[PDB]
Design a protein around this ligand. Structure first.
Ligand code: CHL
Ligand code: CHL
Ligand code: CHL
Ligand code: CLA
Ligand code: CLA
Ligand code: CLA
Ligand code: CLA
Ligand SMILES: CCCCCCCCCCCCCCCCCC(=O)OC[C@H](CO[C@@H]1O[C@H](CO)[C@H](O)[C@H](O)[C@H]1O)OC(=O)CCCCCCCCCCCCCCCCC
Ligand SMILES: CC1=C[C@H](O)CC(C)(C)[C@H]1/C=C/C(C)=C/C=C/C(C)=C/C=C/C=C(C)/C=C/C=C(C)/C=C/C1=C(C)C[C@H](O)CC1(C)C
Ligand SMILES: CC1=C[C@H](O)CC(C)(C)[C@H]1/C=C/C(C)=C/C=C/C(C)=C/C=C/C=C(C)/C=C/C=C(C)/C=C/C1=C(C)C[C@H](O)CC1(C)C
Ligand SMILES: CC1=C[C@H](O)CC(C)(C)[C@H]1/C=C/C(C)=C/C=C/C(C)=C/C=C/C=C(C)/C=C/C=C(C)/C=C/C1=C(C)C[C@H](O)CC1(C)C
Lengths: 220, 219, 238
């Protein structure tokens, strides 16, 4: 499987000879030929959208792992005052604050405003450095800088670099899809992802999403 | 400067390599913020500039119109419904929508006639805005002047430029603030001035995070 | 300059100035006589060109093409949907025993243990499994749309929007190029009306909570009494 060039894998498979636009040359990772809406016809808008895709992908991978991990650790024994991810933020308003792994001695956060303030300070610093560089880079690539972000050195060969780019963007698209799912099915179900999987495995035919289909009907 | 390459930018010192090649410091409010690349085409850029400025002007008027009645409300006027996100439901009251509380001023009773007159006049004026009319055959689509400058503030090009920047910046501020009005009316259910009063009463406890667990599904 | 019967619209097959109101420079525009400077890329060559690109989203010709295809496909789906969201309710108020004719509740019929009888007749489709329904549908519509986007058993070297072979123009209504050109406009206009009315169905569901024909009926009962402003205070933030 090629992942590049004209004979690359495409998002409709065999159905995909004449659907791909002329501007989606197999140059960039994850180019399956999906621009039915034509939103990436301009190469500059295409570059900006590629950056958005990759950053959303990386953030979504981190977030998928961060929503899965505490729940797994929650049933595997560990105290998690609020393990479910869509209420993990409301721990600040509890009696003992947000203890990290349940340990009252680890972080013991009590004020959300100070937490948020530090977060804006350092996130702004880091994202500005990401845009225009800084202590970990001056004129590197906006997406794959390397140097300080390859302490292991996985991608010094261009072919390994390309295949790992594809792997990155695909795990990331998977994570973005899965995070969208987390959102919609938290709103719909009101339970965690792991508990949704457990319930689906307990009764797959009558514990699926269609059980929550008549939930949002107006009914006067 | 607010123009040219050495202009103020959206990330300040960390903004040298964060601006696209097409965002030359030609147009007001160009801080170099097109991370999404939505204005790469100059024509789409022009249309988006018009949308920005019109949203800005409408949002300035609306910000003033949501702040003013509430101020006047505690300052001593009754205002059957002073809060802005229920100011429209006055038509369904007993005496209709009295402007400053005065039953003698407007005394509107029918919302469909109000709306009909509004569509009439608004369509006429917005079509005149797009292609001109009694107040301008072929003037700039954004800064026509010549009847929209009875005071004559912007006959000098430099004053014109700086007032353009002031306009678009007050307008971006108002658009941000109007978005805030929306989200925090939906979240809080109270007016903007009352939200400020409550924040000033106890800033550390009745900020937005007090309403954070409001939209949790909880099965 | 003409005679009475040509003014009255007689003599079909006199149509080359009747495309002038839907194609070309001096056509009908989105604000009519109050839309002067149409976007230069909206030259009047495509059906439904009223000069409306206020947001400049179709400035690139290729994304304009993609948006045209999106528009027409949405239009066709919305026409089918607008017809299908009113046919069951009309048929039920005429007397067909449909168990839930309201469209935003029509999907919940498959969870009743009598199944999803089509016209309320158990001898008909009688679907019980929503998952099997969805699987059948996914297989069929995937094949169908993949055939649409590149070609398939119903013609491969055809247009992406108006294939018009013997499978999609089997009545030959569009063999006259002028009839074709004006039928394109009729298609896109009925379809834009259907898309607007389907947005209306969606909003009238989320807001009103009744059926669309029920809304029509309660509006025709006493219009000024009952309107969309009746439900204006419904989304009050409490
Ligand atoms: C030939 C068979 C084949 C078919 C039919 C498809 C079809 C698809 N592939 Mg694809 N692929 C196929 C082969 C292959 N794919 C891929 C690799 C990929 C990738 C990497 C991706 C795809 C994606 C897609 C999707 C893009 C179209 C879309 O977004 O649907 C849009 C239409 C719908 C979503 C309609 C909904 C369908 C369903 C009936 C929904 C149910 C309706 C709900 C009840 C409605 C809810 C009600 C609400 C409103 C209240 C689509 C499902 C993309 C994707 O996953 O996006 C989603 C994508 O990223 N494919 C490979 C490897 C080379 C293939 C090998 O042959
Ligand atoms: C070097 C420091 C510096 C930093 C970090 C920034 C940062 C920013 N400036 Mg900038 N500026 C900076 C210097 C300067 N600025 C300006 C002039 C301007 C202007 C005129 C504007 C900006 C704007 C912006 C923002 C654009 C990116 C954005 O939209 O945020 C995106 C990132 C976030 C929104 C993160 C949010 C943080 C927080 C954690 C969110 C909370 C999460 C929620 C709880 C989750 C939501 C819950 C959901 C589920 C409901 C960004 C915050 C723009 C702006 O105000 O947009 C908002 C803007 O219009 N700046 C000048 C004058 C020359 C500067 C001088 O140094
Ligand atoms: C092989 C089976 C096949 C089937 C069952 C369908 C079925 C359908 N196609 Mg379809 N197509 C099929 C092959 C193909 N189509 C298309 C190109 C299109 C287009 C461009 C459109 C359809 C649409 C449709 C729908 C309306 C049919 C119609 O116009 O009725 C009249 C008789 C229907 C779901 C329409 C649609 O989905 O709108 C809702 C639509 O716009 N098809 C091509 C490429 C030429 C095909 C190649 O084999
Ligand atoms: C790969 C990602 C992924 C995975 C593994 C799951 C897994 C699950 N989801 Mg989530 N979900 C996802 C993505 C995902 N979802 C996305 C993207 C959305 C937004 C559309 C949702 C929205 C959603 C809702 C609203 C609900 C679930 C629910 C569920 C559970 C029951 C399955 C169900 O009802 O299907 C629903 C699946 C979807 C709506 C779309 C996902 C599309 C899949 C990945 C592709 C089809 C694969 C499938 C095996 C092929 C079936 C063919 C045919 C039958 C159609 C199950 C644990 C339900 C739950 O909590 O039950 C306990 C529930 O209420 N999900
Ligand atoms: C609808 C209102 C609106 C519109 C159309 C624009 C449009 C524009 N802005 Mg302005 N801007 C706005 C509101 C708006 N802005 C507000 C409220 C702020 C303050 C936060 C700014 C602050 C701002 C700065 C600081 C700069 C711009 C710039 C630009 C231009 C390039 C970016 C672009 O194409 O965005 C297109 C915009 C849209 C397609 C709107 C999408 C809206 C979605 C729903 C997201 C909004 C939700 C948020 C959470 C373009 C003319 C840059 C420029 O070149 O100046 C001329 C620039 O430097 N804007
Ligand atoms: C400059 C504009 C502006 C100003 C002066 C205020 C001021 C206020 N807001 Mg509003 N708000 C704004 C914009 C603004 N907001 C916008 C753009 C949003 C949408 C994200 C909101 C969403 C919002 C909600 C949901 C709530 C408030 C609330 C409040 C009050 C408490 C402060 C708080 O919780 O911070 C919240 C601030 C934000 C969520 C974002 C604003 C970003 C600021 C301007 C930048 C950071 C500056 C620091 C000092 C306070 C009167 C709360 C309230 O009513 O308490 C009485 C409340 O529940 N605001
Ligand atoms: C009023 C709506 C309308 C109009 C005027 C047109 C007009 C046209 N279409 Mg489009 N089309 C529409 C709706 C419409 N279509 C919808 C909703 C679909 C999806 C089902 C399609 C799918 C479609 C395809 C796939 C093709 C066309 C083609 C054509 C052209 C020739 C056929 C014709 O004249 O039909 C005139 C339309 C009527 C006389 C309306 C009849 C009313 C029906 C029968 C009502 C009942 C609906 C039925 C029960 C639903 C099941 C289906 C012409 C430009 C072909 C073309 O251009 O090739 C040259 C072509 O290939 N159209
Ligand atoms: C899409 C699927 C389309 C094919 C559906 C086949 C149904 C198979 C089946 O079980 O049918 C079962 C049905 C009978 O089934 C009966 O249906 C009735 C309603 O029609 C009632 O619901 C009864 O309860 C039920 O017993 O058999 C037929 O109807 C086939 C007879 C065909 C008569 C029409 C011939 C005219 C054809 C020429 C005109 C068109 C050119
Ligand atoms: C391609 C194409 C083509 C054509 O042309 C057009 C179109 C169609 C348009 C296109 C498409 C597109 C799409 C589909 C998109 C999607 C997106 C997404 C899903 C995202 C996500 C995204 C996602 C994401 C970011 C995510 C993220 C996450 C995160 C951060 C997390 C966080 C967290 C966590 C951990 C948990 C805790 O407790 C808390 C919090 C804080 C919560
Ligand atoms: C720049 C950029 C860049 C990159 O690239 C991309 C992106 C990101 C996309 C971008 C961004 C954008 C944005 C942010 C936007 C925003 C907007 C807004 C906020 C608006 C508002 C807007 C706003 C507005 C209009 C407002 C308005 C208002 C009004 C009318 C008012 C009215 C009223 C009032 C008085 C009150 C009373 O009782 C009633 C009423 C009737 C209610
Ligand atoms: C032009 C322009 C210009 C400037 O520049 C910019 C702008 C403004 C942006 C633009 C505009 C645009 C627009 C307006 C759009 C719209 C759209 C729509 C409305 C769609 C719908 C759309 C719609 C649609 C698809 C619909 C569809 C439907 C359907 C499928 C149905 C289905 C069904 C039925 C039968 C019933 C049953 O029981 C169920 C169901 C399942 C429900």
């Amino acid at each position: 499987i090629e992942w590049y060039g004209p004979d690359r894998p495409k998002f409709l498979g065999p159905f995909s000879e004449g659907d791909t636009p002329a501007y989606l040359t197999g140059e960039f990772p994850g180019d399956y030929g999906w621009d039915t809406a034509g939103l990436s016809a301009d190469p500059e808008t295409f570059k900006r959208y590629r950056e958005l895709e990759l950053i959303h992908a990386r953030w979504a991978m981190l977030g998928a792992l961060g929503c899965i991990t505490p729940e797994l650790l929650a049933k595997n024994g560990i105290p998690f005052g609020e393990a479910v991810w869509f209420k993990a933020g409301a721990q600040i308003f509890a009696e003992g604050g947000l203890n990290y792994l349940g340990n009252e001695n680890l972080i013991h956060a009590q004020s959300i405003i100070a937490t948020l303030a530090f977060q804006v300070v350092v996130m702004g610093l880091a994202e500005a450095y990401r845009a225009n560089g800084g202590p970990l880079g001056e004129g590197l690539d906006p997406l794959h800088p390397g140097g300080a972000f390859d302490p292991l050195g996985l991608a010094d060969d261009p072919d390994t670099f390309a295949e790992l780019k594809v792997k990155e963007i695909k795990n990331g698209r998977l994570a973005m899809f899965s995070m969208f799912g987390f959102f919609v099915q938290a709103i719909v179900t009101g339970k965690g992802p792991i508990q949704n999987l457990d319930d689906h495995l307990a009764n797959p035919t009558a514990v699926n999403a269609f059980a929550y289909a008549t939930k949002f009907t107006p009914s006067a | 400067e607010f123009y040219g390459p050495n202009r103020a930018k959206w990330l300040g010192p960390y903004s040298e390599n964060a601006t696209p090649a097409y965002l030359t410091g030609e147009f007001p409010g160009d801080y170099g913020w097109d991370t999404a690349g939505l204005s790469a085409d100059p024509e789409t850029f022009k249309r988006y500039r018009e949308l920005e400025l019109i949203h800005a002007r409408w949002a300035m008027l609306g910000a003033l119109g949501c702040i003013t009645p509430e101020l006047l409300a505690k300052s001593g006027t009754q205002f059957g419904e002073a809060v802005w996100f229920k100011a429209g439901a006055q038509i369904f009251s007993e005496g209709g929508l009295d402007y400053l509380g005065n039953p003698s001023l407007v005394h509107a009773q029918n919302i469909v006639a109000t709306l009909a007159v509004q569509v009439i006049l608004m369509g006429l004026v917005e079509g005149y805005r797009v292609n001109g009319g009694p107040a301008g055959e072929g003037l700039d689509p954004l800064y026509p002047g010549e009847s929209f400058d009875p005071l004559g503030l912007a006959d000098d090009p430099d004053t014109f430029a700086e007032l353009k920047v002031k306009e678009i910046k007050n307008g971006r501020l108002a658009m941000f603030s109007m978005f805030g009005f929306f989200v925090q009316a939906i979240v809080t259910g109270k007016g903007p001035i009352q939200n400020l009063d409550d924040h000033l009463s106890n800033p550390t406890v009745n900020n937005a995070f007090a309403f954070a667990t409001k939209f949790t599904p909880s099965a | 300059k003409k005679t009475i019967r040509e003014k009255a619209g007689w003599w079909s097959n006199g149509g080359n100035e009747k495309l002038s109101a839907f194609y070309g420079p001096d056509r009908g525009l989105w604000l009519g006589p109050l839309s002067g400077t149409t976007p230069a890329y909206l030259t009047g060559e495509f059906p439904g060109d009223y000069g409306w690109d206020s947001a400049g989203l179709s400035a690139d010709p290729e994304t304009f093409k993609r948006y045209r295809e999106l528009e027409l496909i949405h239009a066709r789906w919305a026409m089918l949907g607008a017809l299908g969201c009113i046919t069951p309710e009309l048929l039920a108020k005429n007397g067909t025993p449909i168990v839930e004719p309201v469209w935003f509740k029509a999907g919940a019929q498959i969870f009743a243990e009598g199944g999803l009888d089509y016209l309320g007749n158990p001898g008909l489709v009688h679907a019980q499994s929503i998952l099997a329904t969805l699987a059948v549908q996914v297989i069929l519509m995937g094949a169908i749309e993949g055939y649409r986007v590149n070609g398939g058993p119903a013609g491969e070297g055809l247009d992406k929007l108006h294939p018009g072979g013997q499978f999609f123009d089997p009545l030959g209504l569009a063999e006259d190029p002028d009839a074709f050109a004006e039928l394109k406009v009729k298609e896109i206009k009925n379809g834009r009306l259907a898309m607007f009315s389907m947005f209306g169905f969606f909003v009238q569901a989320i807001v009103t909570g009744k059926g669309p024909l029920a809304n029509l009926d309660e509006h025709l009962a006493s219009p000024f009494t009952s309107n969309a402003f009746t439900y204006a205070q419904k989304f009050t933030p409490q």
